[PDB]
Design a protein around this ligand. Structure first.
Ligand SMILES: COc1c(OCCCN2CCOCC2)ccc2c1N=C(NC(=O)c1cnc(N)nc1)N1CCN=C21
Length: 823
């Protein structure tokens, strides 16, 4: 088809990468995958309920926390329906349906209830208490506003028609070269399974010249028949490590990899997921390469008491605790006793000799008897553990994915970023994991939307994985539907337009922080310019797809007075039934790796949900934030928010935050409401902060809302202090120096509960952390020590309370020091 090519060109624009391109490839794993993924797309496409697919209700099954019950303790809920001019209020039970609500409305005196100002719908057989919008309003003291109108046509979701032996192992190393570069140098070759080195050989070292030829067969200890699926041949270059590259020994059709390869290699920055990729370096003209030859096809009682004790001990340990040789032989010998314990599984499967066919066969036999796994309650931290870089067996990874099926869409969103990054640890482009993302994204539009940007964030920035992630995007976009394709297109254009301006603004003053409004005159011109004949009438807010944004409030846009020169932008909201005028605020910023900011924010969200599970609410404020490309993207602007900094030559007054709060609080009520929140918000930011290692912060980077909510910003690259709890904060808590106050006693009390609530999920956190570093940064011990592993709840409460007081001793000391250390 001719028009099927316009489609493929529309898909390339949206992706920012071309998936038909075979210039940087050496087999067909990508194309085979493009093709393999059709089945699962089509099936979930052919499977999803058109109506609910259009209206994408954002629903949960989790109970309501006691803290939103106390916000409505009379079995009643007020919803307000809107005609066009007129409205009418309604009184409702938290267990009503939107089905049932309407009825009482019509029967008071076909159509559907939609949130005011937002694309967001109250529909489906769910009790109104279980809608997130609703729960957002209750937490926010806000009243629900809704608008009775037509269902969105499910034709708007239409999907285009698609069309489509015992010989030891060896490798010859012919040589290396690079146009430009002198120590000595050798090639180390590694047979790798899940970070585990199975066998290793080196070359002789020879002098580093632009072309280096060895002509040497490298014989390893392993038999061909014993190489396992997912084995990487890992080629490295030392002198010590300068370059690396990887190749799959067994391919996506289970064929032993044969032949001549010339492989363009990656270089080291001056251990993380980039070191694992089977992608070759695209920059063919400047990169180091290496020439290789492969010519190696069929592939395919009781327990004593003290031992069980030792055994269970090992299972009790944390992820990061390494296993002895004895521990592994122990796990593997009573592997059937081990299988009974699903927490054991990671330890057990990293206690397998992946280097032996008979064992591996045994391990498959053992995964057949899986019934205890399959019946266990879904433990996500356990499940994630089996998808990190320590696992590279398809069958082990697949039982982890299986566990994920039972997640509802609401949980998926909590884990989506980190599940998207765990695609970096799969050995083959077509994983169970990828198909799970595909499927879930297609099943639900909210998932699909974030799925898009998560993939595009990396596709647009990582040469190590763009090709893989692109194949997967294409596969999503090819099932998401015309209305969302349209949308994604509006959104991409806008983003593209707005980076041009961000970058161009920057190079008009390198660091003369005084933003002369001569610099601000041009911003205005480029925006109006963009307006009249370029910039789409309206577009979805990427970090909050409920909102559709309209036209730039050009007067309210500025450039911020930073080291970089990020854009402060305010838009009009495109929805007419919006119940307010407040502009939608966005910061576009070149200069920070916002991928890392996404990751920290996302954990932050996980922690709330944790805390939710024990009826705590720390009023974290994890703002929207998306990496769009290389060191560039968007950040959500919180309304009525200011820097602790600005509330103050390194001089720091104590009272001024409380004064600031009282001068923004009209009633005395609202001021106490504000001090309450500040304690909660603060307590939460301090705990989370501590756990992750990002509490030593300058005042620039901590803000507070007019309404008392404190929040940290900008997770750039992170004497000392465990968190920021300065005198200004203490002042507000009505205490100073050595004495105490009820507000401080409360804050201490709240920190404690917050901390060990988190410690009830020590493994989950430890994983997400370790994954974050491997896939988000360019060591982990910190966190385990900060979570105080293996301690009774008292030891811990004591620890964290000592921490509180470290900041008390210090006080301004550190804050001061940033200034001092400027000069
Ligand atoms: C300090 O700049 C911010 C705000 O400042 C208000 C000051 C702007 N005025 C007000 C009206 O006229 C223009 C001048 C108000 C709100 C925010 C914010 N920064 C930020 N964040 C950052 O600046 C930031 C920068 N880099 C990175 N990586 N992350 C966040 N956020 C996050 C969401 N809320 C805000």
């Amino acid at each position: 088809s001719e028009e099927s090519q316009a489609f493929q060109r529309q898909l390339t624009a949206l992706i920012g990468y071309d998936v038909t391109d075979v210039s940087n490839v050496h087999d067909d794993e990508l194309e085979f995958t493009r093709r393999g993924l059709v089945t699962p797309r089509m099936a979930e496409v052919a499977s999803r309920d058109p109506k609910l697919y259009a209206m994408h209700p954002w629903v949960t099954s989790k109970p309501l926390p006691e803290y939103l019950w106390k916000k409505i303790a009379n079995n009643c809920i007020f919803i307000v329906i809107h005609r066009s001019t007129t409205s009418q209020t309604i009184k409702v039970s938290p267990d009503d349906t939107p089905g049932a609500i309407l009825q009482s409305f019509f029967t008071k005196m076909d159509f559907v209830l939609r949130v005011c100002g937002r694309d967001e719908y109250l529909v489906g057989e769910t009790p109104i208490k279980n809608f997130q919008w609703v729960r957002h309003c209750l937490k926010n003291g806000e009243e629900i506003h809704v608008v009775l109108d037509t269902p969105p046509d499910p034709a708007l979701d239409e999907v285009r028609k698609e069309e489509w032996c015992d010989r030891k192992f060896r490798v010859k190393i012919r040589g290396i070269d690079i146009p430009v570069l002198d120590l000595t140098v050798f090639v180390e070759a590694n047979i790798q399974h899940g970070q585990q080195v199975l066998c290793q050989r080196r070359t002789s070292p020879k002098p580093f010249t632009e072309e280096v030829l060895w002509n040497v067969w490298l014989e390893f200890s392993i038999k061909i028949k014993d190489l396992p699926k997912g084995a990487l041949l890992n080629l490295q270059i030392y002198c010590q490590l300068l370059y690396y590259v990887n190749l799959l020994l067994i391919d996506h059709r289970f064929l032993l990899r044969r032949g001549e390869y010339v492989l363009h290699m990656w270089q080291i920055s001056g251990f993380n997921a980039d070191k694992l990729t089977s992608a070759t370096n695209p920059d063919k003209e400047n990169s180091m390469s290496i020439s290789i030859l492969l010519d190696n096809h069929p592939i395919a009682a009781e327990m004593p008491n003290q031992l069980r004790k030792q055994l269970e001990a090992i299972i009790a340990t944390d992820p990061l605790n390494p296993l002895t040789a004895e521990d592994k032989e122990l796990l593997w010998h009573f592997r059937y006793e081990s299988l009974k314990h699903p927490k054991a599984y990671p330890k057990l499967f990293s206690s397998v000799k992946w280097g032996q066919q008979e064992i591996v066969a045994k391990t498959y036999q053992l995964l057949a008897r899986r019934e205890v796994w399959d019946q266990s309650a879904l433990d996500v931290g356990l499940t994630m553990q089996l998808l990190d870089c320590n696992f590279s067996d398809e069958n082990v990874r697949a039982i982890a994915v299986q566990k994920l099926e039972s997640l509802e869409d609401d949980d998926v969103l909590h884990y989506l970023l980190q599940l998207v990054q765990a695609v970096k640890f799969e050995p083959y482009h077509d994983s169970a994991l990828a198909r799970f993302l595909l499927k879930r994204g297609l099943r639900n539009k909210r998932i699909g939307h974030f799925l898009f940007w998560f993939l595009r964030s990396e596709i647009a920035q990582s040469r190590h994985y763009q090709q893989r992630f692109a194949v997967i995007l294409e596969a999503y976009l090819r099932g998401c539907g015309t209305a969302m394709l349209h949308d994604f297109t509006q959104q991409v254009q806008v983003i593209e337009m707005l980076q041009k301006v961000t970058l161009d603004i920057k190079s008009l003053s390198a660091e003369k922080y005084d933003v002369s409004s001569q610099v601000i005159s041009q911003l205005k011109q480029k925006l109006e310019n963009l307006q009249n004949s370029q910039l789409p009438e309206s577009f979805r807010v990427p970090y909050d797809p409920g909102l559709k944004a309209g036209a730039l409030a050009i007067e309210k846009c500025k450039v911020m007075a930073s080291k970089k020169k990020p854009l402060w932008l305010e838009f009009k909201c495109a929805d007419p039934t919006a119940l307010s005028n407040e502009t939608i605020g966005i910061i576009f910023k070149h200069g920070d790796d916002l991928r890392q900011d996404m990751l920290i924010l996302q954990i932050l969200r996980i922690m709330e949900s944790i805390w939710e599970t024990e009826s705590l609410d720390l009023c974290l404020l994890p703002y929207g934030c998306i990496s769009t490309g290389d060191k560039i993207g968007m950040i959500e602007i919180v309304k009525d928010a200011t820097t602790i900094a600005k509330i103050q030559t390194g001089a720091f007054k104590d009272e001024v935050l409380n004064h600031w709060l009282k001068e923004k609080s009209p009633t005395e009520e609202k001021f106490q409401a504000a001090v309450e929140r500040f304690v909660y918000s603060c307590a939460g930011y301090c705990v989370a902060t501590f756990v992750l290692g990002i509490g030593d912060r300058h005042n620039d980077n901590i803000m507070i809302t007019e309404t008392g909510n404190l929040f940290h910003i900008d997770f750039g690259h992170i004497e000392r202090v465990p968190f920021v709890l300065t005198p200004d904060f203490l002042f507000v808590m009505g205490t100073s120096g050595k004495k105490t106050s009820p507000h401080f006693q409360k804050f201490q009390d709240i920190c404690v509960k917050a901390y060990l609530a988190l410690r009830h999920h020590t493994n989950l956190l430890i994983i997400l952390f370790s994954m974050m570093l491997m896939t988000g940064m360019p060591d982990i011990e910190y966190i385990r020590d900060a979570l105080t592993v293996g301690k009774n709840e008292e030891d811990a409460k004591k620890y964290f309370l000592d921490q509180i007081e470290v900041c008390r001793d210090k006080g301004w000391t550190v804050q001061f020091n940033w200034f001092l250390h400027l000069v």
